[PDB]
Amino acid sequence: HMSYTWTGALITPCAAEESKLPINALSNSLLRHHNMVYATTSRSAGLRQKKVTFDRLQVLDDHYRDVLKEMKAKASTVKAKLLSVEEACKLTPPHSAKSKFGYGAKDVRNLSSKAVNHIHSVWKDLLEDTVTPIDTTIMAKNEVFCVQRKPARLIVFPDLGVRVCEKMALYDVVSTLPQVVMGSSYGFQYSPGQRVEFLVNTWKSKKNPMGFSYDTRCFDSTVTENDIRVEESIYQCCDLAPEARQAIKSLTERLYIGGPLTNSKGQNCGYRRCRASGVLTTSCGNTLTCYLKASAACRAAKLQDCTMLVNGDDLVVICESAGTQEDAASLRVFTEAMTRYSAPPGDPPQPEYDLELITSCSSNVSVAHDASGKRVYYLTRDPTTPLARAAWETARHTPVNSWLGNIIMYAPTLWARMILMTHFFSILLAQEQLEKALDCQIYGACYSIEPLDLPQIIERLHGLSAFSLHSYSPGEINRVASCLRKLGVPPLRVWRHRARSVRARLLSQGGRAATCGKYLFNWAVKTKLKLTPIPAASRLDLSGWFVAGYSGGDIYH
Numbered sequence: 001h002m003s004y005t006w007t008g009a010l011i012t013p014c015a016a017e018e019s020k021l022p023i024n025a026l027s028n029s030l031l032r033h034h035n036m037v038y039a040t041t042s043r044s045a046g047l048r049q050k051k052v053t054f055d056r057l058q059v060l061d062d063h064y065r066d067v068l069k070e071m072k073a074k075a076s077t078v079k080a081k082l083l084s085v086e087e088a089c090k091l092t093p094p095h096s097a098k099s100k101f102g103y104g105a106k107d108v109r110n111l112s113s114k115a116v117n118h119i120h121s122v123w124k125d126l127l128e129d130t131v132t133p134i135d136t137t138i139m140a141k142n143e144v145f146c147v148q149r150k151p152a153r154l155i156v157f158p159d160l161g162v163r164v165c166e167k168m169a170l171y172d173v174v175s176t177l178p179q180v181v182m183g184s185s186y187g188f189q190y191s192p193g194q195r196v197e198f199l200v201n202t203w204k205s206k207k208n209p210m211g212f213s214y215d216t217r218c219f220d221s222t223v224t225e226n227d228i229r230v231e232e233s234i235y236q237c238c239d240l241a242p243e244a245r246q247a248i249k250s251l252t253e254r255l256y257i258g259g260p261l262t263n264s265k266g267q268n269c270g271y272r273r274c275r276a277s278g279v280l281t282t283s284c285g286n287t288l289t290c291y292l293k294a295s296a297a298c299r300a301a302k303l304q305d306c307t308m309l310v311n312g313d314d315l316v317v318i319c320e321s322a323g324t325q326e327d328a329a330s331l332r333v334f335t336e337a338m339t340r341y342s343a344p345p346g347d348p349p350q351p352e353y354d355l356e357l358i359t360s361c362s363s364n365v366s367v368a369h370d371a372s373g374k375r376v377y378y379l380t381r382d383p384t385t386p387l388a389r390a391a392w393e394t395a396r397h398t399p400v401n402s403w404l405g406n407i408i409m410y411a412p413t414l415w416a417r418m419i420l421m422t423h424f425f426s427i428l429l430a431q432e433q434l435e436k437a438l439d440c441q442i443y444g445a446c447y448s449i450e451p452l453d454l455p456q457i458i459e460r461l462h463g464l465s466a467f468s469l470h471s472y473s474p475g476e477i478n479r480v481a482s483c484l485r486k487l488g489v490p491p492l493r494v495w496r497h498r499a500r501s502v503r504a505r506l507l508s509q510g511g512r513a514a515t516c517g518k519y520l521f522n523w524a525v526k527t528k529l530k531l532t533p534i535p536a537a538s539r540l541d542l543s544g545w546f547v548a549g550y551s552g553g554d555i556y557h
């Protein structure tokens with residue numbers, strides 16, 4: 001029951017790929033250890049293929065079926081609607097990969113006759129045929145990391161026409177069903193601050209809290225045909241139009257369960273029998289399957305008063321401690337059960353008795369103080385990957401601006417405020433591009449955002465306290481400082497000096513620019529200004545933000 005079979009044809013690129021960090025006049029102001037930063041390319045795709053190709057065995061017991069029955073009971077309450085062709089078209093990113101059949105994303109977005117006629121033909125084919133495997137493209141992702149090299153991850157996706165049809169059939173389902181089935185355990189319904197609140201309140205709900213993260217090794221490749229059919233059975237519990245039931249069956253049989261892999265040159269590379277990383281249901285499917293396996297494993301291990309938090313393949317569990325020795329024993333049983341369910345561990349899970357020591361969604365809770373001196377919890381992460389990616393983006397325009405996503409999601413953090421805000425506002429100022437909209441990605445969806453709207457966006461997501469936090473923990477400060485030394489980034493004292501300059505330059509611009517100076521860089525002046533609620537912030541349409549995850553799902557706004 002192999003995750004993949006291969007022909008020996010290579011996974012090929014679409015254009016020249018760079019692995020070495022490009023350097024321009026701005027690079028050394030941010031990062032001097034250029035050799036630490038690299039991008040993955042198709043040259044490492046063979047190594048990735050070896051890692052993700054293996055046999056999956058699955059033994060399913062009564063705990064698994066009991067949890068599944070409960071999930072299906074909750075799913076039965078969901079009513080989901082078909083999207084119109086127009087609605088689905090307007091969800092397509094402007095720079096989404098063009099179709100092989102003679103039209104592109106902008107043709108889709110404009111509702112061109114050619115595009116709309118083809119989408120109708122694809123839809124009719126889904127209704128009429130529930131058996132023929134749907135072709136997919138396989139490509140090596142180009143992502144940036146700091147050394148200590150990862151092989152490229154693989155992306156697998158069907159044609160643009162099919163992607164639009166997935167939205168028509170499943171957008172409402174994948175946006176609504178997860179929170180109904182999993183309630184407060186569904187992670188993608190939370191902003192960063194909401195996630196912190198849930199984690200803190202859950203920790204406090206236990207007499208003697210214990211928590212752990214669980215890392216499944218190569219999750220997508222552990223997902224079996226069984227798993228994908230079980231997912232479909234959950235979708236079909238919803239109140240759906242008959243037409244939608246048929247399209248969902250067809251997509252499951254023809255696309256989600258598996259299909260042929262074609263490289264960028266049109267050659268057959270092999271066949272997939274595990275999760276595709278580039279379909280609409282990747283996020284919802286991984287979340288449901290992870291929750292199902294983990295909930296059943298909790299029961300196997302007799303964990304007391306378990307509360308889970310699930311975002312795709314990323315899992316956190318907080319429960320009542322039965323003692324340190326008993327806790328470690330329970331985790332072994334948990335892992336054994338997950339392994340039987342085809343979710344074997346990467347790193348073995350570790351019990352933690354301090355909430356700040358748990359990492360999940362690459363992040364941890366930490367504590368700072370607000371302007372009144374109150375202790376406030378907030379979400380942070382190790383800044384190594386953010387800074388490596390920011391270095392790349394200093395010298396190259398990319399389709400997704402990680403620095404922008406990171407400023408939005410980690411606005412309250414020491415590193416996002418002192419380094420990312422300072423560095424990028426200085427660059428944009430110099431080019432007068434503050435008002436130019438940029439694409440970023442949050443929970444898998446693409447947003448087009450004007451940097452000048454950051455103050456209002458931050459206030460809405462994090463509150464005004466994001467502009468006032470200070471007295472960060474020694475642990476957090478020490479981690480940031482050591483990261484800077486590692487990458488050869490100037491120390492925080494240099495960044496404070498630069499932020500005073502950037503703040504003054506923004507204030508001299510007037511308007512929204514001055515608001516950025518005032519709010520984003522109040523921390524850099526000795527005599528702070530008041531900072532009152534921004535009237536524009538109460539006006540922003542942040543509907544669609546933090547409802548669901550759509551990683552690989554080709555979703556825009």
Ligand SMILES: O=c1c(C2=Nc3ccccc3S(=O)(=O)N2)c(O)c2cc(F)ccc2n1CCC1CC1
Pocket residue numbers: 191192195283311312313314361362363379402404405406407409410441442443444549550551
């Ligand atoms: O977890 C993320 C995700 C995210 N997490 C995921 C976790 C598991 C599966 C799929 C995703 S995903 O591809 O949908 N995206 C982001 O897209 C993200 C983007 C930012 F710009 C900054 C931080 C981000 N974080 C950490 C923030 C923490 C509240 C959860």
